[PDB]
Design a protein around this ligand. Structure first.
Ligand SMILES: [Mn+2]
Length: 300
C-alpha cells in the first residue's frame, strides 16, 4: 500500500529509561503488535540487531521493520566519524528492506536524563547552525546514495524542539535531508503540527502519530519536571484518545493533498502498568486509520 501503519515498542518497553516496562518481553511486544494489525514496528532496545535474528522474530509475525533510531553526535564528532557510526544501521536497514533511517542529535540532549528539568534543554548557538546543518545533509546524502532516506526527529530536550528550530534545520539542509514529523513532540514543544506540515510536507518522509495530554504538559512546565517524569505521568497518548489534544485529521489532510507515501507510526511511550500497551495501541491504530480515511489519505 501507499500508506503503511506501524507502531513503536516504547509503548511496551521504554528506551530512554529501561526500567519502564522491563517486565514485558520482546515476544509479548511483537505478538501484540502483530495481532493488533500493524504492518510493521520500529526498532527498540530489546530487538535483535542482526539481520537474520531480526527476520526470525518479525517475518513469522508478518511485521515489517519500519526503521531504527540512530543517535547523532555531529556537534562533537567529525562528519566522517558520523558516517562510520551510522553505517551499521544502514546495513541492517538495507537487509531488512527499510527505506528510512531516523536520526537526532543527542550529544547534548537531556531527554534521557531523569534529573534535568526539560527547561534546561540545550539551545544551539546561531553561529553553529550552518555547520551542523551541513553535517546533517552530508549524512543524508551518504544514506541516500545507499537507497536510505534520512528523516530528522525533532525531539523535546534536544537542539531541535521548537517550530522555529524546525524551520532552521530545514533551511540549513536539503535536498536529501527529510523531516520526521512527530505530532506529539511538536505540540509539546509549543508548536502546531498542522502548520509545520503545511510548511514542510514536501520534505516530510516519515510521520509519528503521537498524542499529548495537555494537563500533564502543563504539570511538566509548572513543576519543572524532566522529560522522563512527564512520560511516566502520561504526557503522551495515542490518536483517538479523548484525553489527547492533537488534531490529527488536518495534518493527514495536508499529507493527502501533497501525495504523501510511507509510514504512519503510532509512537506513544507510557507507563505500561498504568496505560496498557495492547489497549492503547489498538485504539491508536483503529482511530488513526479512521482519521486517514476521513482526510482522504487512505483510499481503500
Ligand atoms: Mn517519534
Amino acid at each position: 500500500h501507499m500508506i503503511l501503519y506501524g507502531t513503536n515498542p516504547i509503548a511496551w518497553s521504554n528506551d530512554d529509561d529501561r526500567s519502564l516496562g522491563a517486565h514485558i518481553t520482546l515476544d509479548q511486544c511483537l505478538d501484540e503488535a502483530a495481532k493488533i494489525g500493524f504492518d510493521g514496528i520500529e526498532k527498540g532496545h530489546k530487538f535483535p540487531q542482526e539481520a537474520a535474528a531480526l527476520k526470525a522474530v518479525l517475518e513469522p509475525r508478518g511485521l515489517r521493520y519500519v526503521s531504527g533510531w540512530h543517535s547523532l553526535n555531529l556537534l562533537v564528532n567529525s562528519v566522517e566519524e558520523e558516517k562510520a557510526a551510522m553505517q551499521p544501521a544502514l546495513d541492517l536497514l538495507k537487509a531488512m528492506g527499510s527505506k528510512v533511517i531516523i536520526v537526532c542529535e543527542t550529544s547534548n540532549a537531556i531527554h534521557g536524563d531523569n534529573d534535568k528539568p526539560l527547561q534546561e534543554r540545550p539551545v544551539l548557538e546561531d553561529a553553529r547552525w550552518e555547520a551542523f546543518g551541513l553535517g546533517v545533509e552530508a549524512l543524508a546524502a551518504h544514506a541516500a546514495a545507499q537507497g536510505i532516506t534520512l528523516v530528522y526527529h525533532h525531539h523535546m530536550g534536544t537542539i531541535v524542539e521548537t517550530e522555529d528550530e524546525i524551520d532552521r534545520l530545514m533551511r540549513f539542509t536539503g535536498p536529501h535531508t527529510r523531516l520526521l514529523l512527530d505530532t506529539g513532540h511538536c505540540l509539546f514543544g509549543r508548536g502546531n503540527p498542522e502548520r509545520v506540515a503545511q510548511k514542510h510536507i514536501a520534505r516530510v518522509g516519515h510521520i509519528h502519530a503521537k498524542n499529548i495530554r495537555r494537563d500533564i504538559v502543563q504539570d511538566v512546565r509548572d513543576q519543572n519536571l524532566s522529560f522522563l517524569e512527564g512520560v511516566r505521568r502520561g504526557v503522551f497518548t495515542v490518536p483517538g484518545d479523548t484525553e489527547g489534544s492533537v488534531d490529527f485529521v488536518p495534518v493527514l489532510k495536508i499529507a493527502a493533498e501533497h501525495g504523501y507515501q510511507g509510514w504512519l507510526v503510532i509512537e506513544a511511550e507510557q507507563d505500561p502498568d498504568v496505560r496498557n500497551p495492547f489497549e492503547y495501541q489498538s485504539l491508536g491504530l483503529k482511530s488513526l486509520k479512521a482519521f486517514a480515511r476521513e482526510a482522504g489519505l487512505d483510499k481503500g
